[PDB]
Amino acid sequence: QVQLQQSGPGLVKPSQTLSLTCNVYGVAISNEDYYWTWIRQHPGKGLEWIGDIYYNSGTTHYNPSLKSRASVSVDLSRNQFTLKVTSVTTADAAVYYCAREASTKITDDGGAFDFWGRGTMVTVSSASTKGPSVFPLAPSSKSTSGGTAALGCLVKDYFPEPVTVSWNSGALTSGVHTFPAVLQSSGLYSLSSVVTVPSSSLGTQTYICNVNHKPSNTKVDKKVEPKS
Amino acid sequence: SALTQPASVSGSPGQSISISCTGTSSDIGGYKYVSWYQQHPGRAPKLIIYDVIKRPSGISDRFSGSKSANTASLTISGLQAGDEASYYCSSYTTKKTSFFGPATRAYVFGSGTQVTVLGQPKANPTVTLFPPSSEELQANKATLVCLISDFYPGAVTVAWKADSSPVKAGVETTTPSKQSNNKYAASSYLSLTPEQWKSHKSYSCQVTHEGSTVEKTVAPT
């Protein structure tokens, strides 16, 4: 029933203020049974409880580790709640999760985080963002073996992570594979997205990839035809 | 500060496996609110155990858990291939905000334990090698794309050859990453100039994996 949407992923500069929003569906935040919690996961590390808020009390609680640099707010007109972390450093860069804390009974002090969000990726860098360049990896006699044929998009020179690639507006999902990105010496990321398809669909059926770079607010649509 | 946990624990299919989470007195040793979270690469965590023993709705009986003193245990019986993910223990705790004052509520997580399943069938990588597009060449760039999907275990060796001779400069290769089907994928990139591309007969990408080798070859045409 419960569904939690976090804001889009993002770049934040050092010594500036991180701010994330979490939209709640299926249950009210004004509720009495649930604390609403923020948790982050550092790259290649375990989880870290950031802080939570309980509405009926109005009391917020935080992890002393953040030196009181974090604050949690609520907005009932939209049934959403937000986290604000100030004076961020490279050590605050992470994948931020928003979760619902639920107990067995109101008498119980604690509980567990049953429902989580997909997570927003927050990168901390003074360097500017950059939208991706999208080159077509065209199908050919090389990317073929009998009845199957592989075609793709090269998403090159972009920063920061992540990027959302789709094919034909999220319709074609059969055979799609997006590889994780390489980190070039320049600091810019690059990745490929390839879809495997029938061979008898290259001349007729059209294939369009849709690349979305939210960190830099770029959206590219590219058609990948067979070379001619 | 995080709860102590073994970096990795492994077991063969069908058998039971146990993951111990060592805490303190201010949590687990003190409180009943210990829980477990499963996290596949690289989705969000999901609840599987809470209040030491109880399972949420939708979780199989295979996932059991217990507590003793200041240590909790997660016992997975009837082990399967889909139970290959990261498992974190969490606990309710209490801490002092300032040096003094009432102890504020908090939660503490574990380091995490990587569960590996034994005796999975080895898989050979599907290799692809794309040449530079005309558009990229127009931009004065040139990148050969060597994609390596669906192999097991996650150990592979990539190499690039200009015509028949190896090349080391310009090579950028991803580390293997776990797929949903527990197999591994990876990709490699060879950045050149249009001059290097058009002034050679062929370019090749070698993939070596468990005795098998696969060399893909492209050419400027």
Author numbering:
A (entry chain H): 1 to 35, 35A, 35B, 36 to 52, 52A, 53 to 82, 82A, 82B, ...
B (entry chain L): 2 to 9, 11 to 27, 27A, 27B, 27C, 28 to 95, 95A, 95B, ...
Manuscript excerpt for this entry:
In this study, we isolated the neutralizing monoclonal antibody CAP248-2B, and used structural biology to characterize its epitope which spanned both the gp120-gp41 and gp41-gp41 interfaces in a manner distinct from other antibodies. CAP248-2B extends the interface target to include the gp120 C terminus, effectively encircling the base of native pre-fusion trimers. CAP248-2B was predicted to be derived from the IGHV4-31 and IGHJ3 heavy and IGLV2-14 and IGLJ1 lambda chain germline genes, and displayed modest levels of affinity maturation, with 13.5% and 9.7% nucleotide mutation in the heavy and light chains respectively. CAP248-2B possessed an average length CDR-H3 of 15 amino acids, but had an unusually long CDR-L3 of 19 amino acids.
We determined two crystal structures of the unliganded CAP248-2B antigen binding fragment (Fab) to resolutions of 2.0 Å and 3.1 Å respectively. In the 3.1 Å resolution structure (not influenced by crystal packing), the 19 amino acid CDR-L3 formed a β-hairpin which was stabilized along its length by seven hydrogen bonds, and protruded ~15 Å at a right angle relative to the other CDR’s. The tip of the CDR-L3 ended in hydrophobic residues Phe95C and Phe95D that were angled by Pro95F and immediately flanked by residues Ser95B and Gly95E which may confer a degree of plasticity to this region. In both structures, the angle at which the CDR-L3 extended from the Fab was stabilized at its base by germline conserved hydrogen bonding interactions with CDR-L1, as well as a salt bridge formed between CDR-L3 residue Arg95I, and Asp50 in the CDR-H2. Overall, the CAP248-2B antigen binding site displayed substantial structural plasticity, an attribute that likely contributes to its mode of neutralization. The unusually long CDR-L3 of CAP248-2B was specifically angled towards the viral membrane but its tip retains a level of plasticity that may assist in interacting with dynamic viral lipids.
